[PDB]
Design a protein around this ligand. Structure first.
Ligand SMILES: Nc1ncnc2c1ncn2[C@@H]1O[C@H](COP(=O)(O)O)[C@@H](O)[C@H]1O
Length: 343
């Protein structure tokens, strides 16, 4: 299915920096070991400062990744917080539209913005893993659960189903060469947690990182985020959201409960909760504010919407891959999400 895999830095430029080189070289070797030919797009390794300063270079890399028929899959390096800045370089003169096609695209976090970009252009994408975060796992092997989904994707171009992991892991405090070959701290995973509504619900999934979506509507982080996202109509129409399942997950920022609440209400203000078929929420990173987020969801989300919490999707580890734009059936009782590529 996949032979050449192209690595893009569309958010932070970290993967080019000396201090992560040991991690990068490890992931490169793993991709090779999986039967892939990993290539870095021309600007992807230019480092933090260059990539921050040149969103146009990022856009160039993405356009090239889609345009180049030899590239079978696009893997995001890592998230960040400013990929919105690519919008004019992708959309002003239909630059991305001109080259766009159905090709595997995988990332999470700030990449949420890019997922919305690609959705706009009619592309089905894949949420929930990145090169640095998953492929460069510092233990001897990739996390088993994560690897299950990655290998499925590269072998079949699809994810058939998601089931909960048996365990979850803490985020590392040490990513230096010293950490090589050392294991993450493990916890028992208690599975999908049906907070409210029906245990069965269906629809195509779209969403990603709550913090990312919030910057569509709240210009605190970047003063022109809302302007750019409005100009380019990045947030889907409510007729588009109608009958979809929204995914939400929280980042390493670990918003305090009152800020989580403010984010959910800001989303509510879009009208999205009136039209969706259900809500999937990832386990918070490190389970930080796990209980508080649960309470906030129960307090705020419209009463008619089913909510499944504690998915192994997002910033906690290990990490499932979630197809976007593919009909899903969620069964909270049986603890499975099944995908139907024909629907
Ligand atoms: N050097 C690193 N190596 C591996 N994972 C990292 C590194 N830096 C950050 N992460 C993790 O990558 C995940 C996604 O980061 P981000 O895309 O920036 O939200 C988070 O859970 C981070 O803790």
């Amino acid at each position: 299915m996949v032979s050449t895999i192209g690595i893009v830095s569309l958010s932070s430029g970290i993967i080019g920096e000396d201090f992560v080189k040991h991690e990068v070289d490890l992931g490169i070797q793993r991709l090779k070991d999986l039967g892939l030919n990993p290539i870095f797009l021309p600007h992807s390794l230019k480092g933090l400062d260059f990539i921050k300063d040149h969103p146009e270079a990022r856009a160039e890399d993405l356009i090239h990744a889609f345009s180049d028929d030899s590239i079978d899959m696009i893997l995001c390096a890592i998230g960040g917080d400013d990929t919105y800045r690519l919008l004019p370089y992708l959309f002003e003169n239909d630059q991305l539209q001109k080259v766009i096609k159905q090709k595997i695209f995988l990332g999470f976090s700030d990449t949420t913005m890019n997922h919305l970009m690609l959705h706009k252009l009619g592309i089905k994408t894949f949420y929930g893993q990145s090169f640095l975060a998953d492929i460069c796992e510092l233990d001897k092997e990739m996390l088993a659960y994560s690897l299950h989904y990655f290998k499925e994707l590269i072998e079949t171009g699809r994810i058939s189903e998601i089931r909960p992991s048996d365990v979850w892991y803490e985020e590392r405090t040490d990513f230096s060469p010293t950490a090589l070959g050392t294991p993450r701290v493990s916890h028992t995973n208690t599975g999908f947690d049906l907070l409210q509504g029906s245990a069965q619900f269906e629809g195509k999934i779209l969403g990603g990182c709550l913090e990312s979506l919030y910057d569509i509507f709240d210009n605190s982080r970047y003063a022109d985020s809302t302007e750019l996202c409005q100009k380019y109509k990045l947030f889907p129409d409510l007729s588009d959201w109608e009958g979809k399942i929204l995914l939400l997950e929280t980042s390493e920022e670990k918003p305090k409960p009152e800020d989580f609440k403010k984010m959910l209400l800001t989303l509510k203000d879009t009208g999205i909760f009136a039209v969706i078929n259900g809500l999937l929420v990832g386990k918070p990173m490190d389970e930080t504010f796990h209980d508080d987020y649960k309470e906030a969801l129960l307090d705020i989300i419209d009463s008619n919407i089913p909510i499944v919490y504690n998915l192994n999707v997002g910033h906690a580890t290990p990490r499932a891959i979630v197809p976007f734009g593919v009909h899903a059936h969620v069964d909270a009782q049986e603890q499975v999400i099944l995908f139907d590529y024909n629907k």
